[PDB]
């Protein structure tokens, strides 16, 4: 029932959480943020890291 990411779809596969505690979305699907492997260190979603 709950949806996440920029696509606003349910949880599926591997998801990564934005390290900004105040991120409005928080969880994103790896594919939606062009990731294949768990990043090392802090990770911020496109919105929080300043992308358009």
């Amino acid at each position: 029932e709950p949806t996440y990411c920029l696509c606003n779809q349910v949880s599926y596969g591997e998801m990564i959480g934005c390290d900004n505690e105040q991120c409005p979305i928080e969880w994103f699907h790896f594919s939606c943020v062009s990731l294949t492997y768990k990043p090392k260190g802090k990770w911020y979603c496109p919105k929080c890291r300043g992308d358009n």
Partner: peptide, 8 residues
């Protein structure tokens, strides 16, 4: 990073 595998 913080990641999780979808479960259930």
């Amino acid at each position: 990073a913080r990641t999780k595998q979808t479960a259930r």
